[PDB]
Structures are given as structure tokens and as C-alpha cells.
Amino acid sequence: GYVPKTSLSSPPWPEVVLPDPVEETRHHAEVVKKVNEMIVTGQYGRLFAVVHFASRQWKVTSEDLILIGNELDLACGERIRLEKVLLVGADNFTLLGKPLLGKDLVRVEATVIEKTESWPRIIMRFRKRKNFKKKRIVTTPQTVLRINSIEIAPCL
Amino acid sequence: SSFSRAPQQWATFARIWYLLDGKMQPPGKLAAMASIRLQGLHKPVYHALSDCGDHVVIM
Amino acid sequence: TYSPLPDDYNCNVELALTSDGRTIVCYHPSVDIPYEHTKPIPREEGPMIEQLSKMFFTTKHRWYPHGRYHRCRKNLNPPKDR
Amino acid sequence: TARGTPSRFLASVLHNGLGRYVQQLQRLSFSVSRDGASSRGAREFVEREVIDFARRNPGVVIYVNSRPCCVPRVVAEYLNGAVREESIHCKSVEEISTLVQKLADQSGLDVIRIRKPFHTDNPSIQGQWHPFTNKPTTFRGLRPREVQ
Amino acid sequence: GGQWRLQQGLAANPSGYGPLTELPDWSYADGRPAPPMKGQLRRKAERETFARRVVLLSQEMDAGLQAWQLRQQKLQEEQRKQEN
Amino acid sequence: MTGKELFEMWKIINPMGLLVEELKKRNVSAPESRLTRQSGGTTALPLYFVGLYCDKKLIAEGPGETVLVAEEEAARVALRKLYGFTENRRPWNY
Amino acid sequence: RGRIPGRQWIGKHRRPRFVSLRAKQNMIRRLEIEAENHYWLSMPYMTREQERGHAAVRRREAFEAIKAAATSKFPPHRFIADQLDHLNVTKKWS
Amino acid sequence: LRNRVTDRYFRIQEVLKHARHFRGRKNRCYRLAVRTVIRAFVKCTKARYLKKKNMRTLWINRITAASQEHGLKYPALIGNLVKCQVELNRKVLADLAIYEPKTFKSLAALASRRRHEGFAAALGDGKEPEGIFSRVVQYH
Amino acid sequence: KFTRSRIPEKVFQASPEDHEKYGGDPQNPHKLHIVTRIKSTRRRPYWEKDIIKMLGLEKAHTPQVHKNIPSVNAKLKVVKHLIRIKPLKLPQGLPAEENMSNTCLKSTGELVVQWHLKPV
Ligand SMILES: [Mg+2]
Numbered sequence: 004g005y006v007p008k009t010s011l012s013s014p015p016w017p018e019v020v021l022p023d024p025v026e027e028t029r030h031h032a033e034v035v036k037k038v039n040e041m042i043v044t045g046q047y048g049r050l051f052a053v054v055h056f057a058s059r060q061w062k063v064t065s066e067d068l069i070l071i072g073n074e075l076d077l078a079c080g081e082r083i084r085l086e087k088v089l090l091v092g093a094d095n096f097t098l099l100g101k102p103l104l105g106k107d108l109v110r111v112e113a114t115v116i117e118k119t120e121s122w123p124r125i126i127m128r129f130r131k132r133k134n135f136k137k138k139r140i141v142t143t144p145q146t147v148l149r150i151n152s153i154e155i156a157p158c159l
Numbered sequence: 160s161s162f163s164r165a166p167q168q169w170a171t172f173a174r175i176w177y178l179l180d181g182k183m184q185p186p187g188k189l190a191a192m193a194s195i196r197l198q199g200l201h202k203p204v205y206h207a208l209s210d211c212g213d214h215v216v217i218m
Numbered sequence: 219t220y221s222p223l224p225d226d227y228n229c230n231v232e233l234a235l236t237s238d239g240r241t242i243v244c245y246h247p248s249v250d251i252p253y254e255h256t257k258p259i260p261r262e263e264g265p266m267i268e269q270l271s272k273m274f275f276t277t278k279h280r281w282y283p284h285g286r287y288h289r290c291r292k293n294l295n296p297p298k299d300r
Numbered sequence: 301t302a303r304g305t306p307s308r309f310l311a312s313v314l315h316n317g318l319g320r321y322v323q324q325l326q327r328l329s330f331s332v333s334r335d336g337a338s339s340r341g342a343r344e345f346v347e348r349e350v351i352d353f354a355r356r357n358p359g360v361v362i363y364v365n366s367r368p369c370c371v372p373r374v375v376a377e378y379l380n381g382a383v384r385e386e387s388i389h390c391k392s393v394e395e396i397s398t399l400v401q402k403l404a405d406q407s408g409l410d411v412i413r414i415r416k417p418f419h420t421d422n423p424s425i426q427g428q429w430h431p432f433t434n435k436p437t438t439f440r441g442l443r444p445r446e447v448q
Numbered sequence: 449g450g451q452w453r454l455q456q457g458l459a460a461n462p463s464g465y466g467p468l469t470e471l472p473d474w475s476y477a478d479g480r481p482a483p484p485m486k487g488q489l490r491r492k493a494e495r496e497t498f499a500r501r502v503v504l505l506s507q508e509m510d511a512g513l514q515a516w517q518l519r520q521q522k523l524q525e526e527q528r529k530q531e532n
Numbered sequence: 533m534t535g536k537e538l539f540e541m542w543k544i545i546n547p548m549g550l551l552v553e554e555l556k557k558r559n560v561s562a563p564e565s566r567l568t569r570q571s572g573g574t575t576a577l578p579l580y581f582v583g584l585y586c587d588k589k590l591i592a593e594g595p596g597e598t599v600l601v602a603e604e605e606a607a608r609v610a611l612r613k614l615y616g617f618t619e620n621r622r623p624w625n626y
Numbered sequence: 627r628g629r630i631p632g633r634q635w636i637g638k639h640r641r642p643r644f645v646s647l648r649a650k651q652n653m654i655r656r657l658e659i660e661a662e663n664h665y666w667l668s669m670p671y672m673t674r675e676q677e678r679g680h681a682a683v684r685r686r687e688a689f690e691a692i693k694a695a696a697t698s699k700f701p702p703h704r705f706i707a708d709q710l711d712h713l714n715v716t717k718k719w720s
Numbered sequence: 721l722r723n724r725v726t727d728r729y730f731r732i733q734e735v736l737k738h739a740r741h742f743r744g745r746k747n748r749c750y751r752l753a754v755r756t757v758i759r760a761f762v763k764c765t766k767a768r769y770l771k772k773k774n775m776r777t778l779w780i781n782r783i784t785a786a787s788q789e790h791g792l793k794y795p796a797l798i799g800n801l802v803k804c805q806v807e808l809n810r811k812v813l814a815d816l817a818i819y820e821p822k823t824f825k826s827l828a829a830l831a832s833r834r835r836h837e838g839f840a841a842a843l844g845d846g847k848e849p850e851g852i853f854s855r856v857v858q859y860h
Numbered sequence: 861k862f863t864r865s866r867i868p869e870k871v872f873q874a875s876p877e878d879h880e881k882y883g884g885d886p887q888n889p890h891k892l893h894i895v896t897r898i899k900s901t902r903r904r905p906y907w908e909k910d911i912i913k914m915l916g917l918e919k920a921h922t923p924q925v926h927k928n929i930p931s932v933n934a935k936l937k938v939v940k941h942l943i944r945i946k947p948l949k950l951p952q953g954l955p956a957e958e959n960m961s962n963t964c965l966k967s968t969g970e971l972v973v974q975w976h977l978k979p980v
Contacts, residue, residue: 505891
């Protein structure tokens, strides 16, 4: 099945050889241990987190503010835990969920700072030459939350 | 990181100089690369209103 | 020896999976610029608009003034974030 | 519309949640009337709900003034100095209660368009992207086509 | 990439069924569970109605088959009885 | 002080001098300014990333419009790192 | 130059339309779906005789509910409490 | 003139207030201001769909920029992240690219890793062991 | 004239090749169809619109369970070009009253009776 070297004899892309599964799993374990030791020793500063709240994903950090477009049925100043954290990251390492990280791994806590109504939004419908004109004013409830802390535990 | 506000902004919105060599190169592919760089579409901070273009020198 | 991406720029990425395989760990320490990859520190309206355009690699149009309407429409106390 | 209206950025009065939550509302002045069908709901609210609300929110001073009025009103004064005046004219007890609770839970910041649904004072932890990130460095820092 | 999700058996839309959406979005810092989300309650009601309809249809079809079998019996032993 | 910068709160002059003094106290060789990266050197909008190297080891680097400004900002960055008030430092605990 | 007489897409001389590989693939995908539909419809569970009357009771009960809803249409009740509550519009204090 | 309108001033002002920032007589004459304001409100209503569409387009453009910086294409990055079962959306991906370049480099490395695992699986089609990252967590 | 289409019966007579391809045994046929409207009734005949409404497939991509009986099959044959039909599978059997509230219809067409939302 030999083919002389021509422009089309071999694919343009380079040939990649993935590491053997056994040695690669050993390396995986070593890297996980290293990152776990970093967490144990607290060798991280600010932590950010991609957290799925409401229906969206927010990139979040301690002291951050988030505007959820609805009432949450929570008294202002009440503390909450955001449970759907997709990603937690530090300066030197990041942990990715599949698709969600563990509760024992990540704890993101927020506080319901404010409950408000959005500024009036105009919904205008108009069709030319049909006497079709309509106007509506809508104020969507909103809650402002402040993300107090993002804590990680050595559970890798 | 840890930069002051003005230096950080300058570094982020600095315009870079790229060099293309057109010898035996298709003018269309050269133009595609040059247009991307000129628009700044190669920058993650790209926005049509940010004037994030970069200089392209084609020899 | 396999590396998904070159490690000569930005952080050195090392991917891993926890034993349960339910979470990916990424170790990406930043790469410092080698000292050898560094150099030592060295030690009228028409003509004006043409000079400015040459200096800043722009067109003449932006350097012309604007009317009072636009000047007073411009917001002098814009909201500031961060 | 947004272009015809002022806008601001999401913010808190004094980083209201970092150390401790502080109720931004501080004063509630209810101008009510002894007589007048407009302030019937206001009178019922003063009778049945204002005391409970006052004891629930000890940080808010409530001044109930009953004087001849055609349009009963509630004036909410917040810590940041904002004053919001609302009409409780011909509003039922439930409507007045919901309005008062909304004022209590609402901050003094202007109710205008908010440019971003989020506000970070430390957006970057790994370093904000600049053109020289993800760019390899060359030996002796030689720019392209440099001879020496 | 919904085709890959379909192949793996997940919802083509990640916003569909799955932990990412059906799990509670939050809980009290004390650990107390949050009240069920409105969307989750509606989805649970819809799945309950779907399951109840599935059961109803299957039971109706089984009952119809049993009734048809019983009718065929009745016919067979009748035919035999007036044959004898 | 949330969101504030070290030298936004504490005005200083001669950050290079402060850095030299601090490194002398910490028994580290005096920093060497070095041109790590540059762009548009001859233009009216240059960028200069200047790094401070001690014992051929990068301690910090800073951007600027001119080389002097870049060096001054790199000194500020090095001071922030030495004092542990980096932007990505551990957030205050409440 | 290059005019299409009259209106595009309607006249005798219409603007030519050409099928792209994208459209061909879309149509093929839909055809595959419909072929699978044919397969899954080609295997009935019960026969017509077996199904005869197996849902008659439920259908009759559903129509009985519909008829009851239709025939229960009748004006709502009226209450002295509702009539007298209007006197509260002039409720005052003392 | 038994009954006459006395609020016409305020009725006109309800529109002129929204028309104040227009150009020409459209900000002064009601006969013109009303038409312009109706058009402006209709545009504002219709602009929410375009706002969402343009936000997604901008996120895709920025993700493409970052992926090209790391040597990948946007389709490859997105598809391989999905295959890795990382459900980061385009907004968050663009935010990471702008503000967390090292995290985005890690994500691009993961996407390329999964892409190469898929290529290896296709090449050695059969019952060869599944790629380490290719393995999919199953939820029940 | 455009009229209602009479599909020849031979179209709905599966072959062994089809059985192998689609994984369905001619004996022991499936009891219930999962039907999803994947096509708009707009630009289609009013009779197809009415059949879709009868089957309750007004919302697109919303699965509906139907009996695999000749009459429902006739309606599905009428509107087959607008719908996707799959066999409902019950790996754990029919849901019981105890687990009626924990069911979920997975994209594979299986109505699992336990939905824990936890990794296996
Ligand atoms: Mg024409």
C-alpha cells in the first residue's frame, strides 16, 4: 500500500500520536494531585466561576453584581447558594464540570441585594395603511444579587 | 494583570503591525488575511465601534 | 510528548480528569518571557489635517469640527463602569 | 426608548451586600385623607398593615399624615438621597401593600435603563487580553525582517 | 451540536431535560432546599400527564384485545353448542 | 477599597526607586529594565511592554506608550506583586 | 445588463433557480425521516376488528362531559353582599 | 362649545417628550412628532430580536478570533467542547477569551484534544478503547 | 386538480431489510407511537391542518403519545410528511402510580420511570 510522496499522497494536516492510555492516565492522576495540593495549600487568589442561574450562564467573581430578570421570592439581604456552577477558575488552574461541578468541589454564595422593576419597556405594533397601531408598557421584575464568595474544597 | 487602568487600556487597544509576503501568493488570500487584520476581527476584544484595527504591510 | 497546543506562548496547559472522570482539571501556569528573548532598553486647516491624518493613519474627515447641534448633543457626563 | 432616556450601570449604593445588607429605604411619608373615596384603600392600609410593616422594617421611619387630600400619596426617601413619590389614589389595600413592599425592597438608584446586567470591579483574574497575549517571543526580541 | 447529544441520548437542546436545567438553580446558604422553580413544576406536571396518558392508552388497548379474545371465545363455544 | 488600585489609594513617586529599595531590603539584585515587546515604535501610538529582570528572572512587566512610562508601570506592577496587593489577589473575607 | 423580464419567479421567463448541496442534503434528510415514518407505520398493533369499540366508552364519556358543560351555561349568581359592598365607597374615618 | 378638550396640551406633550431628541421639526410639530415617535417605538420593539442576534454574532466573532489565535476554528472549538460535555455558552466563551486568556487556552487545548481523539477513533474505526476525554458521563 | 393523495398499501409493508435497518421485529409490534410535528402546517391543505389538530400536534417538536392502531395509523399516514413517528419504549415497563411523577421521555424514545438527575 506504499504511495510515493506527492502533494496528495498524504493528508495536508500533520499526523498526531495521542499518548498511550495507561501512561496518560498516570499523568492525569499526577496533574489532579498537583492541583489538589495547590487547593489544599491555598495557592490561589481571586476565583471566578461560570454559574448557570435563571436561564443564563454568568461569569462571576467575589463582590460581583448580577441582575436577574425576575423576582426570586427572596427577602432582600437573604443569602443564597448558586448550585449550578459549570466552571471554577483561578490564576493558575481551572476546573470544568461535565457539565456541572460538584457541590463538594465548589460553593458559590450570593445575597439578594435588591428587588426592583425594570425601566418601562415600550412594545409598539404598527402596520402601514391598516389603522393598526398599538402600544403597551411593560416593567419586568428584577433582582440584583451580590456574589459574596466563591470557595473551593480539596475534593479532586 | 495588575496593570494600572490607562496602561491596561492602552495595551488592550494597541494596534499591532503585521507583515505579509505576497511573493507567489494569491491576492485573494492575501486580501482575506489583510482585511481580517485591518478590521481587527482577529482580536477577542473586537467590536465595529472600537476602532481596533491593526496595520498590515504587504511586501 | 504530545501537546494539544504549543506551550511557547501564554500558559503551559496540562489537561486532566479526576478519577471518577466527572470533572476536567486544567493546570495552566503562565510562561515568563525568557531574558534571552528581550532587548536592552534604548538610551492652516488643510495642512494641519493632512499632517494629523499622516500621523495617526486616519482620514481627513474625523479631524474636521462638528456643529453646535452635535457638540451639545454629546453627553459630557457619561455613565462610568469599573 | 433607550436613546431618548438616560442610562446607568448596575451598581449598589455602598457595596450593600459585601459586609452587611442595609435597607436603602429610610423614610415613608403617607399623605392620606380622613374623607374621600380616593384614599379609602390608604385608610384601610393605615388601619391594618402600616403597623405590621413598620415593625417588620425597623430601619424605616413612617410618617402618616391625614390631611384633606384628593390624591393620597406615598413618598419614599432612600439613604442615597433619592426621593420617589407614588400615588396610592384609588388603590386597594393589596395594591398599596405590594407598592410599599416594592419600595422597601428597592434601592434608591434611578429606575432607568441599565447598560449591563452585571458589574464586576475585577473582571479579569488571569489578565485582560492584549494583542501580545498568545504571541510567542523571539530570540533577542528581533522583529520580523530585522537583520541583527 | 445537537446531533451528538441525540446520539449520546441527551436532549438535542442542552436546555431540555437533564441536570443542567432540571436541578434546582439555588438553595439557601443554610442548606435548606429552595422552593421548586415554576418551570420545573410545569415540566413535572407535563411529564405526569404524559405518563398518565401512556398508561391510559396501553390499558385501553390491552382491554380491547382481551375483549376481542373473549368475543372470539363466545363465538367459538356458541357455534359448538348449537352444532351439538 | 474594593475595585481600587494600590497606587490609586496610595499615591507614590519614583516607583522604580521604591522597588529598588524594597529589593535591597529583600536582598535581591537590582532590577534590570528590558524591552520585552514593542509595537509601532516610530508611530504616534506606540506600545512598549517593558519587563524588570532580576538575576535574569522576570519579576514583573508593564505596558506603556513610551519606554519610560512602560518601565515606570512595570515598577508599579513589581511593587504590587511584592506587597501582595495584586489585582488577582485573594478577595477580602467577610 | 442582465435583466429578468417582468417579475422574478412568476412569469414565463423566470430568474433561474439552482439547488445547492445544502438544499439537496436537507431534502434527503427529510426523506430519510419519512422513510422511517413509513416503516414505523407499517406495523399496526391491533387489527381493525380488534380495535372496534375499544375506546367507545371513553369517547362517549368525553362527549357527555362536553354536553354537560354546554348545557350548564346559565347566568351566574347575584349576592346582597356584592350589591351592598358598593356603599363602602363613601367609607370615612371619625 | 358645550364640551371642549382642555388637556390637549398634555396630550401633545406626552408625545413631544419622546420627540424632544429628534432633528428638525419632528421634535416640535405634533403632526410630525407623532409619526416619528410611533416609528421610533416600533423600531425599539423590533430591535430586541436584533439585539439578541447581534450579541450572538459578536460572541461568535470574538470566539472565532480567540480560537484562531490558538490555531482552532470556531466550529471545531464549539463542537468539540460540546463533545467534551462542557456546556459553556457563546457569551461566557467570549467573556473568557477577553478576560481569562489562560482559561480560554485551556479550553481550546481541550477542544483540540477531543478533536484529535475523534480523528483517531474515525481512523482506527472499530472497538478500540474510547478516548480519555471522549468518554461521556451518563446521567439517569 | 390537486387532491387528497391515496398512498398505495405496498408502501406500508415493511421488508426484512427495513426491519434490520430500523430495529423493529414484525412480530410483537410496538404499542404506542411518539409523534412530533417537525413541519409546519402552513402551505399545506386544510385537511392536513385538521388532521394535525385532531392528533394534537399543533406545537412543533412536542412529543405526543398515540395508539398504534389502524385508525390512528390512517391519520398518521395522511399527515406523515409533517411528523416524525418513533416507537415508545418502556425499558422499566409502564409507569406505576408510585413512580408516575418521576417519568421522563428521553430523546431515544424511552420513557424511563426513574429520573434522578444524577451520574450513573
Ligand atoms: Mg421586473
